[PDB]
């Protein structure tokens, strides 16, 4: 059995579950695996399941506050970008460039190019400890963090502080807690109503902040959803809105993970919107493609991805939310691509005309929620009616480049429109375009050569 530390304070929810504050000693079987597992308390002797990701082995790298893993370079930044956090900021993750070495990430800030990320290499060979300049050498990661607290020593900035975060997501709301009873529910804030029901910021058990979205009753078969809701559960991604949990009794409750900041619709309308720069609503579209990107790996179809689909947490995190759930509405007029409630602007023309929806179809409305990006939630094709837009579209017509909006996007969008589905981008090349955009200036890594 190995000792576990706790990266986190967790809270219990349950009866068969185990809190623990941060720093508590936990035994689990070794080579256990899965989101919940069972644990006892070397501090308490209590015993319960516990989430696998609050925990890293005790004296463990993966135990440190400040070693965050595989993190890619984009997202450290973005964590470590946030305005609340001093010069010297930090984090400590694996190269993604050279197998075995690790990069110190640290804020920085040059009276020439303001707020920035410095990245520097750690190496380790056989021939002598860690290094950033092969002139000053540690015993460990450990070690080296705690130099460099003390004096820059050839670094941008010492260390000041560990990149904070947020206590992450629990994968579930328990173990086995799936379908769950509505009382376990409490509905705090209704964040507002769309076309077929209501979506709330709530708690679950007393303990739990989640988003809770509300069907009016009539909208689709509890069974057919509880069914597809089988199918949802299994799409796990960073950037897709997790699915934690349903009331499967009319009105069906689906329960999700909370996003703090709203929809990217509003936030683009909003006071926020304002002032967002390209590289960030290139960053945000760039995180929507890699949520797609995963959808179609799983062969899956959002159906209605635009900006009221996509949520929006702390540091512009961008996920998709309510994929697959479109195809369950059994509103005759809705089902025939008709109707007030049906977004004909966002929707390719076979998927409106003959009822095939594809990621194809997909990428177009991706599309035409880069039109939304560009102009801050404009409503596309700014001069029509929604009963004009697909004899438009079907005969060609396609949206002229926004003002706002620089050609090269452009260009992708129309890539997005083209007629035949099969000659559409994939969103593998969408993601990979997106995060390629701009050609960066400084160099990847600081040049440890001499510091």
Not at 214 to 226: D, I, V
Request: glycine share 6%; charged share 25%.
């Amino acid at each position: 059995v190995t000792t576990f530390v706790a990266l986190y304070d967790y809270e219990s929810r349950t009866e068969t579950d185990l809190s623990f504050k941060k720093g508590e000693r936990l035994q689990i079987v070794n080579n256990t695996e899965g989101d919940w597992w069972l644990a006892h308390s070397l501090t308490t002797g209590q015993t319960g399941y516990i989430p696998s990701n609050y925990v890293a082995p005790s004296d463990s790298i993966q135990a440190e506050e400040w070693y965050f893993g595989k993190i890619t370079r984009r997202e450290s930044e973005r964590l470590l970008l946030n305005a609340e956090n001093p010069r010297g900021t930090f984090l400590v993750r694996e190269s993604e460039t050279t197998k075995g070495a690790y990069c110190l990430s640290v804020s920085d800030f040059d009276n020439a190019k303001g707020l920035n990320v410095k990245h520097y290499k750690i190496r380790k060979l056989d021939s002598g400890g860690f290094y950033i300049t092969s002139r000053t050498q540690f015993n460990s990661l450990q070690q080296l963090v705690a130099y460099y607290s003390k004096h820059a020593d050839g670094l941008c900035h010492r260390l000041t502080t560990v990149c904070p975060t947020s206590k992450p997501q629990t994968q579930g709301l328990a173990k086995d807690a799936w379908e769950i009873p509505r009382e376990s529910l409490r509905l705090e804030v209704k964040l507002g109503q769309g076309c077929f029901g209501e979506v709330w910021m709530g708690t679950w058990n007393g303990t739990t902040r989640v988003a809770i979205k509300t069907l009016k009753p009539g909208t689709m078969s509890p069974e057919a959803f509880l069914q597809e809701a089988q199918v949802m559960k299994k799409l796990r991604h960073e950037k897709l809105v997790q699915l934690y949990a349903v009331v499967s009794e009319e009105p069906i409750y689906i329960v999700t993970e909370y996003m703090s900041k709203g929809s990217l619709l509003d936030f683009l309308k909003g006071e926020t919107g304002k002032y967002l720069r390209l590289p960030q609503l290139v960053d945000m579209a760039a995180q929507i493609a890699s949520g797609m990107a995963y959808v179609e790996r799983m062969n899956y179809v959002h159906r209605d991805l635009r900006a009221a689909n996509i949520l929006v947490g702390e540091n512009l995190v961008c996920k998709v939310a309510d994929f697959g759930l479109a195809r369950l509405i059994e509103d005759n007029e809705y089902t025939a691509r008709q109707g007030a409630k049906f977004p004909i602007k966002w929707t390719a023309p076979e998927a409106a005309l003959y009822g095939r929806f594809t990621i194809k179809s997909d990428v177009w409305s991706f599309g035409i929620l880069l039109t939304e990006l560009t102009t801050k939630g404009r409503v596309p094709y700014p001069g029509m009616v929604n009963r004009e837009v697909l004899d438009q579209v079907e005969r060609g017509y396609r949206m002229p480049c926004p003002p706002e909006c620089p050609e090269s996007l452009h260009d992708l969008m129309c890539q997005c429109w083209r007629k035949e589905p099969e000659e559409r981008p994939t969103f593998e090349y969408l993601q990979a375009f997106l995060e390629d955009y701009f050609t960066s200036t400084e160099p990847q890594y600081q040049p440890g050569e001499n510091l």
